[PDB]
Structure formats: structure tokens, C-alpha cells
Ligand binder design. Structure first.
Ligand SMILES: [Ca+2]
Ligand SMILES: [Mn+2]
Length: 233
């Protein structure tokens, strides 16, 4: 049984109606080797009480760069269930349990989900970024807590896009956007480490493990693609 100190455990008063409705999306539950074992809701997949029992889902993170090699850093809206108000990567979300997004060859299901969410969150039309533009790079397995009740536990596909795009972001999803140079991203993380700014834990991981390596090479990142690999971070 899950102990409940009080009914404050069930509080989602900061979350808007749209984000509450999205808690019912059916996600792809996987094992530690990224094999599909079933479906479960966004709500269930992001409860620490379930994550601690091993519940794990497939997800993605996108790093989007313009042609001046600035990265798009989202600030999550204050209405997100997890990490509200935090600065983070360009787009994170999950493929859904449906035929189109379950498709595994060349990670097309995940890349379709990424297009879908770049459109939904940032208002980037499909004409500007299609799945062909979204490059599969590698996979990382991570766990984080947003608060005592909610958190993350993902086999997370790291995807890269380098394109100039237009934005019409959904304020339900996104509070603000920064386009940072590599130097400015390093500075953001230095400030995070002092306590100045809230940043999702996986952004530091992606930056220090991958982005600094890749940045001088954004014109062709194909050497850095890792198949048959899951980083445990
Ligand atoms: Ca998201
Ligand atoms: Mn997740």
C-alpha cells in the first residue's frame, strides 16, 4: 500500500485542464532493453510510487539547433505536471501506444511522435520538420523526481534536428524559449549548479555527455549515431 500523509498528495492545482486531460494518453511501457511489454497511462507512468516498482516507458528528447548553431531551450509552462517552470531541451515527450508510433524500424515511431509534439508544443509545422529531418542519435535510461509524488523513468531516445523554423508555442506547454549558443548553455548550467535557475536534470546530462562533443560538428553528426546502445545515466 502507498502511504498517504494527507490528501495534498493528490493535488494538481497548478496544472491546467489540457495537461490534466493528457494524463490519460496511453504510453508504451518497456523493459530495460527497450522491448515493448504493454501500455499504461501518462498518469501511471509518471507516479514515483509506480516508478519505484520498476515501471518504465519509452520517451524522447529533441535537441533542435538553428543554422547559427544555437540550441532551442524551452522553459516548461507552470502548468506541466512534471518540472513546471524548468528550463529543458527543445522538446521532450513520448510515443503513444498506436500503430504509427509503435513502429520501431529506424525509430520511425519515435520520430513521428517527435514531429507531432514539436508541432503541438512549439507550433512548428510539419512542412518545416518532418520525421526525415529528425535524426536518431542514441538512447539514455534515466530516472528523476519532479516532487515527492511525480517523476520520470524512461528509455529516452535522443533526437537531433538542425533547421531554421518558425514558432507558435502553446502556453499550456511552454512558458518561454531561449536560443542559446554552446557557451550560453554552459553558463545556464553553471547558474543552475549555484541555484539561480531550475533546469531539468537530463539537460545537463545531454549537454555534458553528448552536445559539447557534437557541437563543432552539427553540419554532419552521423559519426556520433549509436545503434545497439543504451546509456545508463
Ligand atoms: Ca513535452
Ligand atoms: Mn516520461
Amino acid at each position: 500500500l502507498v502511504p498517504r500523509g494527507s490528501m495534498s498528495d493528490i493535488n494538481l492545482d497548478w496544472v491546467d485542464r489540457r495537461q490534466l486531460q493528457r494524463l490519460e494518453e496511453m504510453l508504451i511501457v518497456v523493459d530495460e532493453n527497450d522491448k515493448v511489454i504493454g501500455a499504461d497511462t501518462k498518469r501511471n507512468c509518471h507516479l514515483n510510487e509506480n516508478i519505484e516498482k520498476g515501471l518504465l516507458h519509452r520517451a524522447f528528447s529533441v535537441v533542435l539547433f538553428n543554422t547559427k548553431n544555437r540550441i532551442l531551450i524551452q522553459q516548461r509552462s507552470d502548468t506541466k505536471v512534471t518540472f513546471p517552470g524548468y528550463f529543458t531541451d527543445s522538446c521532450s515527450s513520448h510515443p503513444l501506444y498506436n500503430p504509427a508510433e509503435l513502429e520501431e524500424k529506424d525509430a520511425i515511431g519515435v520520430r513521428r511522435a517527435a514531429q507531432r509534439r514539436l508541432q503541438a508544443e512549439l507550433g512548428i509545422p510539419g512542412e518545416q520538420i518532418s520525421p526525415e529531418d529528425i535524426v536518431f542519435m542514441t538512447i539514455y535510461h534515466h530516472k528523476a523526481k519532479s516532487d515527492r509524488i511525480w517523476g520520470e523513468h524512461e528509455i529516452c531516445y535522443l533526437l537531433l534536428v538542425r533547421k531554421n523554423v518558425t514558432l507558435n508555442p502553446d502556453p499550456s506547454e511552454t512558458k518561454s524559449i531561449l536560443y542559446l549558443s554552446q557557451e550560453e548553455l554552459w553558463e545556464l548550467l553553471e547558474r543552475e549548479a549555484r541555484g539561480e535557475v531550475k533546469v531539468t536534470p537530463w539537460l545537463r546530462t545531454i549537454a555534458e555527455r553528448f552536445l559539447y562533443r557534437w557541437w563543432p560538428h552539427l553540419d554532419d553528426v552521423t559519426p556520433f549515431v549509436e545503434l545497439h546502445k543504451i546509456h545508463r545515466v
